[PDB]
Write a protein that binds this ligand. Structure first.
Ligand SMILES: Cc1cc2nc3c(=O)[nH]c(=O)nc-3n(C[C@H](O)[C@H](O)[C@H](O)COP(=O)(O)OP(=O)(O)OC[C@H]3O[C@@H](n4cnc5c(N)ncnc54)[C@H](O)[C@@H]3O)c2cc1C
Ligand SMILES: COC1=C(OC)C(=O)C(C/C=C(\C)CC/C=C(\C)CC/C=C(\C)CC/C=C(\C)CCC=C(C)C)=C(C)C1=O
Ligand SMILES: CCCCCCO[C@@H]1O[C@H](CO)[C@@H](O)[C@H](O)[C@H]1O
Ligand SMILES: CCCCCCO[C@@H]1O[C@H](CO)[C@@H](O)[C@H](O)[C@H]1O
Ligand code: SF4
Ligand code: NA
Length: 581
C-alpha cells in the first residue's frame, strides 16, 4: 500500500459505481412531516418552536421534525455569546420564569488596541456598535439546550445524533426533503456487515439551518443559483476556550474586546473576553481571524494562544484553569453577501445564509428572528388554499419579503461598510477611522455600499513571497498545544469510517498547496486534522487526514486556496462534545 486514496467517501466515489456494493440493498424507510428542519441551533430551534406555537394558537396539526449532528442538543454550539434579547423575548416573552439561562446582564463594555507591550484604551460611546447596553452574556450551548427543551415540550420531534447527509428532490425539481446519514461503512468505503441506510424525511418544506457554511446549503446555492445577486460570503475563524479564574480577578458582567497585536494591520481579527455571572468565577474568551488573511504561514490557533500572553491579559488568567476549547467559523460578509433565501421546497435561515452583524459580533438575535419569520410565513402557507404549484414543494417566497421588512434588514444594512472599509492602506485602523465618521456620526447613511475583495480562498500569497511567523512555544499554563486543546473539545468519531474531509483530487494538497503555499491546511485547521507525513520511498510527503479530530468548524472548506476540499457530515453523533460553549 500507498499514497493512500485519502478519499473514499461515497460523495466522491458513488457506490452505485463501485463493485464492492453489488449485493447491498439501498432501500430507505421514510417518514412524513409538514416541515423538516436541519440544525438545532438558535435558528432551527426558533423556527421549530414558533411553528409549534402557531399550531397551538390556531389548533391545527403540524408534524415538525428537527435533525441535528450533535450527540445531544447544544454540543456543537460555539459562540462567545453576548446576546441581544430582541428576538428571543419575542419567541419567549415568558423566559424568566420558564428558566432560560440569561443570568448575566452586561454591566461594563471595554475595548482596547494592543501593541506587543501595551494596551491603548478606546472610548466606547453609546453611538458605536460595540455598545452592549441591554444585553446578556450567555453560554449559547446552554441556551440552545434550553430551547430544545421548550421545543420538545411544544411537540417538536427532536432528533439529535442524526445528520442530514443528502437533499431529496421531487421530479419537478423542488426539494422533497432530506435523508439522514447512513451508518456502518469502513474507512475504505466498503460496506460492513452492520451497514445501515439512513432515514428519509419528506416534507412540504424543509428549513435549512446548518449555520455558518452549511454543507447542504453550499450545494443548495448551486442547485438554485441563489448567489446570483450577491457577493460571495466572507468568513472568519473563531477559537474559544473556557476558563475558571481567581475570584479576585473575576468581574461579572464585564465584556472585553481588543484589536491589534498579535495581528499586523492588514490581518482582520481580534479578541473577546466576557465574565460570566452564573455562580463560578468563569470566563468565556477567544480569538477571531478573517479567513481573508494573506500569509500562508499564519496560524489562527497560535495567534490566539500567543494573544493570551499580552500583559493586559495574562495576569487575568494567571493561576487560572482552562477547562474547554472549541472553534467555529463565522460570517463577516454581512449584508452584501446575503443570497436568495428561498426555493421550491425549502428555506435558508440563520448563519447558513448569514445575518451576522460583524461590528457588533452578533448573529444570534438575527438568526433567531429569521427562524421566527420563516415559521410564521410557512404556517401561513400551510393554513390557506391559495395553491401554488408544479413544485410539490412549497416556495415560501413571502419569507424573504418579510425578512426584508423586519429590523433585521436595516440593522445589517446600516453596518454594511464597516468590515470592507478595512481593506485600505491603514487596514483595520482605517476601518476604525471609517467607523467613527460614517457610523458614529452618520449612522451608515452614506450613499454607497463598499465591496469585499472576493473569496477568502484566493487571498493567499505564495509562501516564497512571504516570511514565516515565529510563534512562541506554549508554556502549558497560559498557552497550550493543539492536541491538549483538541482533548478539551471532547470531539470524537468512529475511527472506522471514510474521512468526511473529502478531496476532489488527492494530489493537489501535495502538488499545489504544500508546493506553492507550504501546506496551509496544517496551520489553518484548529484541530490538527491535516498533516504531511514524510514519504517512505525517497523524497517527499503524503497528506494524512486525521478525520477523527475534526471539530466541524468548516474552515478548511472555506480557506483551501485550491478549493479542493468539501466538508460533509460524518456519522451522526460525531464531533465536539461542547458543554455551554
Ligand atoms: C467565536 C464566536 C463568537 C461569537 N460571538 C457571538 C456573540 O457574542 N453574539 C452573537 O449573537 N453571536 C455570536 N456568534 C455567532 C453565533 O454563534 C451565530 O450567529 C449563531 O450560532 C448562528 O446560528 P444558527 O442557529 O444559524 O446556527 P449554529 O449555531 O451555527 O448551528 C447550526 C447547527 O446545525 C447543525 N448542522 C449543520 N449541518 C447539519 C446537517 N447537515 N445535519 C444535521 N445538523 C447539521 C450543527 O451541528 C449546528 O448545531 C459567535 C460565533 C463564533 C464562532
Ligand atoms: C474581536 O472582534 C473584533 C473587533 O471587535 C472587538 C474589531 O473591532 C476588529 C477591527 C476593526 C473594525 C471592525 C472597525 C471597527 C470599528 C471600531 C472597533 C470602532 C472604534 C474606534 C473609533 C471609531 C475611533 C474614533 C475615531 C476617530 C478619532 C477618527 C477621527 C475623527 C472623528 C470621527 C471625530 C476586529 C478585526 C475584530 O476581530
Ligand atoms: C459632531 C460631534 C457632535 C457631538 C456629539 C454628542 O453626544 C453624543 O451622544 C451620543 C449618544 O446618542 C454618543 O454616541 C456620542 O458619542 C456623544 O458624543
Ligand atoms: C476607507 C476605506 C474605504 C472607503 C472608500 C472611500 O473614499 C471616498 O473618498 C472621498 C475623498 O477622496 C470622499 O469624498 C467620498 O465620499 C468617499 O466615499
Ligand atoms: S478538518 Fe476542517 S472542519 Fe475539521 S476542524 Fe479542521 S478545518 Fe475545521
Ligand atoms: Na445583493
Amino acid at each position: 500500500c500507498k499514497v493512500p486514496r485519502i478519499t473514499t467517501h461515497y460523495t466522491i466515489y458513488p457506490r452505485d459505481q463501485d463493485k464492492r456494493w453489488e449485493g447491498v440493498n439501498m432501500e430507505r424507510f421514510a417518514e412524513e412531516a409538514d416541515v423538516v428542519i436541519v440544525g438545532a441551533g438558535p435558528a432551527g430551534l426558533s423556527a421549530a418552536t414558533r411553528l409549534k406555537q402557531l399550531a397551538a394558537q390556531h389548533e391545527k396539526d403540524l408534524r415538525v421534525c428537527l435533525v441535528e449532528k450533535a450527540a445531544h442538543i447544544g454540543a456543537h454550539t460555539l459562540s462567545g455569546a453576548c446576546l441581544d434579547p430582541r428576538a428571543f423575548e419575542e419567541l419567549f416573552p415568558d423566559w424568566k420564569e420558564k428558566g432560560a439561562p440569561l443570568n448575566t446582564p452586561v454591566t461594563e463594555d471595554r475595548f482596547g488596541i494592543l501593541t506587543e507591550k501595551y494596551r491603548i484604551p478606546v472610548p466606547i460611546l453609546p453611538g458605536l456598535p460595540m455598545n452592549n447596553h441591554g444585553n446578556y452574556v450567555v453560554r449559547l450551548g446552554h441556551l440552545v439546550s434550553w430551547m430544545g427543551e421548550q421545543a420538545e415540550a411544544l411537540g417538536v420531534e427532536v432528533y439529535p445524533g442524526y445528520a442530514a447527509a443528502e437533499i431529496l428532490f421531487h421530479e419537478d425539481g423542488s426539494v422533497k426533503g432530506i435523508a439522514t446519514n447512513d451508518v456502518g461503512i469502513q474507512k475504505d468505503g466498503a460496506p460492513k456487515t452492520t451497514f445501515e441506510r439512513g432515514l428519509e424525511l419528506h416534507a412540504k418544506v424543509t428549513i435549512f439551518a446548518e449555520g455558518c457554511h452549511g454543507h447542504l446549503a453550499k450545494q443548495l446555492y448551486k442547485k438554485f443559483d441563489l448567489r446570483a445577486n450577491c457577493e460571495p460570503q466572507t468568513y472568519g475563524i473563531g477559537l474559544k476556550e473556557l476558563w475558571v479564574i481567581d475570584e479576585k480577578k473575576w468581574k461579572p458582567g464585564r465584556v472585553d474586546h481588543t484589536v491589534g497585536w498579535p495581528l499586523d494591520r492588514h490581518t482582520y481579527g481580534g479578541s473577546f473576553l466576557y465574565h460570566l455571572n452564573e455562580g463560578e468565577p468563569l470566563l468565556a474568551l477567544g480569538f477571531v481571524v478573517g479567513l481573508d488573511y494573506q500569509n500562508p504561514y499564519l496560524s489562527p490557533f497560535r495567534e490566539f494562544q500567543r494573544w493570551k500572553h499580552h500583559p493586559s491579559i495574562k495576569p487575568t488568567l494567571e493561576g487560572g484553569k482552562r477547562i474547554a476549547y472549541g472553534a467555529r467559523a463565522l460570517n463577516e460578509g454581512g449584508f452584501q453577501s446575503i443570497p436568495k433565501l428561498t426555493f421550491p421546497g425549502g428555506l435558508l435561515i440563520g448563519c447558513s445564509p448569514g445575518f451576522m452583524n460583524v461590528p457588533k459580533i452578533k448573529g444570534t438575535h438575527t438568526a433567531m428572528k429569521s427562524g421566527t419569520l420563516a415559521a410564521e410565513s410557512i404556517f401561513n402557507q400551510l393554513t390557506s388554499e391559495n395553491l401554488q404549484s408544479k413544485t410539490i414543494g412549497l416556495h415560501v417566497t413571502e419569507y424573504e419579503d418579510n425578512l426584508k421588512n423586519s429590523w433585521v434588514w436595516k440593522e445589517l444594512y446600516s453596518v454594511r461598510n464597516i468590515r470592507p472599509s478595512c481593506h485600505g492602506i491603514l487596514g483595520v485602523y482605517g476601518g476604525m477611522i471609517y467607523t467613527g465618521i460614517f457610523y458614529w456620526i452618520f449612522r451608515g447613511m452614506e450613499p454607497w455600499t463598499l465591496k469585499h475583495k472576493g473569496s477568502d480562498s484566493d487571498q493567499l500569497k505564495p509562501a516564497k513571497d512571504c516570511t514565516p511567523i515565529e510563534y512562541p512555544k506554549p508554556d502549558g499554563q497560559i498557552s497550550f498545544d493543539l492536541l491538549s486543546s483538541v482533548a478539551l473539545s471532547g470531539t470524537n468519531h468512529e475511527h472506522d469510517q471514510p474521512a468526511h474531509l473529502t478531496l476532489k483530487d488527492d494530489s493537489v494538497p501535495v502538488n499545489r498547496n504544500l508546493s506553492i503555499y507550504d501546506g496551509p491546511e496544517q496551520r489553518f485547521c484548529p484541530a490538527g486534522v491535516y498533516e504531511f507525513v514524510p514519504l517512505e520511498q525517497g523524497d517527499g510527503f503524503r497528506l494524512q487526514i486525521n478525520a477523527q479530530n475534526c471539530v466541524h468548524c468548516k474552515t478548511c472548506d472555506i480557506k483551501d486556496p485550491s478549493q479542493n476540499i468539501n466538508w460533509v457530515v460524518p456519522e451522526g453523533g460525531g464531533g465536539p462534545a461542547y458543554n455551554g460553549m
